[PDB]
Design brief:
The protein has about 475 residues and is of the alpha/beta class. The chain has 15 helices and 25 strands. The chain binds (1-ethyl-1H-benzoimidazol-2-yl)-furan-2-ylmethyl-aminee.
């Protein structure tokens, strides 16, 4: 790493200086490092230039705004300081070059939208790896090679991706936040493909409002290397995107493919939601097929079909994707199904707000021939507002509501429960069982063979906070034990 080589595309005159690490933070700036001084949210890194120089940085790249011309090379206390205008916009490219263009050294797939990012990225990484890639994810769980995912500027993004390349990754599925995009955090990434899941941005109901928002997004889009575009045609904004992108792949499970366009497409033609997942028949421009998904709910059919269409688009063979689909797993504690021969279907989900709970119940209902049970509670010593709302949701969208504890902390457990019940039209028909373990047991053992028991609120977590203590407790382990299986 050399300053001169780093800057060659932009500043031909730049001096030659060995560089160690690249950093935005003058505090962490070590000897031999490259300090980048950017202007941000009430904050000017340029004021920390003397600090970093005293900490022994090898060189500095600084925002030229008001202070210098673009590409002006100065020298303070020996150390070269180079000014670039619109540095925030160019940071991703600068960092890309610094870390030897990590997105050119693996297949990077970006997933954006309100919901389904985590699952869709997870499925992409899994499926690609099943087909022989070494796959990684960068998302809100964390970053890492599949199974080794550890829990954030444009530099950090390029640095993390470079780390994954170094660890041997050939494929990376990255969640892309709308916040990230607008702030140029992925501006210079070479995406092999870009997936759009959906949009639940309200405050867009005017055609004076909707227009600046869309215009801003179209512009940004035109500035990114998006690669192959894969778009959910069951979303209204999805169809607007598709109207203007003839090379994009449309994906649908609800009849929104317009085959007149002669584009690439993929649609589910029938889905049977059963007690251990979903059976999905689809047609596509790559040919037809049938998948057994071990994921629950309609949204997860959609996510799976997006992952499939993306991989097909990138040239992974249909036959191999089909042969491997059955090994695709849910994200731990996200509509995670537990079945055992001759027992009720049990689903562990982390849903802990009214919205999430409603979605999880609706999803579970599709798979439920019998009664749908909902085992849940609400956090103690936290905001109380959601309690009666979650109560009303359980009452409406389930047949049996079992109200129990969920991290009651220092608050009286029964007080929390009373707050939940107050939300119901007929609290008297709700079952209350204190001791979360006992409540789960009550549902699992009373439910019929074709009932579905949703156990909501904890998902992957392995603790129940009672008082000051984190006791060892898992919904997954509790369920697994009761059904005579492994978690
Ligand atoms: C990183 C890709 N990306 C997306 N989402 C996925 C998509 C939309 C249309 C096809 O795929 N929306 C964007 C907006 C501006 C820049 C880039 C964007």
């Amino acid at each position: 790493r050399n300053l001169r080589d780093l800057l060659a595309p932009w500043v031909p005159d730049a001096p030659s200086r060995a560089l160690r690490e690249m950093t935005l933070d003058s505090r962490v700036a070590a000897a031999g490092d490259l300090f980048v001084a950017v202007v941000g949210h009430q904050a000017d890194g340029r004021r920390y230039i003397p600090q970093a120089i005293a900490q022994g940085v090898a060189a500095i790249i600084a925002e030229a705004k008001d202070e210098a011309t673009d590409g002006e090379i100065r020298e303070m206390h020996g150390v070269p300081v180079i000014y670039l205008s619109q540095l925030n916009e160019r940071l991703s490219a600068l960092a890309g070059r610094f870390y030897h263009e990590p997105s050119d050294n693996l297949r990077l797939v970006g997933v954006t939208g309100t919901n389904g990012k985590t699952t869709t990225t997870q499925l992409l990484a899994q499926w690609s790896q099943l087909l022989g890639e070494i796959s990684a994810v960068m998302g809100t769980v964390g970053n890492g090679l599949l199974g080794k995912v550890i829990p954030g500027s444009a530099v950090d993004v390029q640095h993390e991706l470079a780390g994954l390349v170094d660890q041997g990754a050939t494929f990376c599925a990255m969640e892309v936040s709308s916040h990230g995009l607008v702030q140029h955090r992925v501006a210079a990434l070479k995406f092999a493909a870009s997936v759009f899941t959906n949009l639940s941005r309200d405050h867009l109901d005017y055609h004076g409002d909707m227009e600046h928002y869309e215009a801003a997004k179209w512009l940004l889009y035109s500035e990114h290397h998006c690669g192959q575009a894969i778009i959910n045609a069951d979303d209204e904004v999805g169809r607007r995107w598709l109207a203007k992108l003839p090379d994009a792949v449309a994906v649908s499970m609800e009849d929104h493919i317009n085959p007149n366009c002669h584009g690439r497409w993929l649609k589910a033609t029938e889905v049977n939601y059963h007690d251990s997942g979903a059976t999905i028949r689809f047609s596509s421009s790559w040919g037809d097929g049938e998948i057994e998904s071990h994921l629950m709910g309609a949204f997860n059919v959609s996510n799976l079909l997006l992952a499939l269409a993306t991989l097909l688009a990138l040239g992974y063979p249909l036959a191999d994707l089909l042969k491997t689909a059955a090994r695709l797993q849910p994200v731990c504690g996200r509509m995670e199904v537990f079945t055992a021969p001759g027992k009720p279907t049990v689903v562990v989900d982390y849903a802990h707000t009214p919205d999430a709970l409603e979605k999880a119940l609706q999803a579970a209902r599709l798979h439920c021939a019998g009664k749908l049970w909902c085992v849940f509670g609400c956090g103690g010593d936290r905001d109380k507002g959601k309690r009666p709302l979650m109560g009303a949701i359980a009452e409406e969208f389930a047949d049996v509501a079992v109200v129990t504890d969920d991290n009651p902390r220092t608050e009286e457990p029964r007080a929390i429960i009373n707050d939940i019940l107050a939300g119901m039209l007929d609290a008297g028909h709700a079952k209350v069982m204190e001791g979360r373990a006992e409540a789960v047991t009550c549902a699992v053992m009373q439910a019929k063979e074709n009932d579905v028991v949703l156990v909501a609120g904890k998902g992957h977590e392995d603790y129940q906070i009672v008082g000051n203590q984190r006791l060892d407790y898992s919904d997954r382990v509790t369920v697994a034990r009761l059904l005579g299986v492994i978690a």
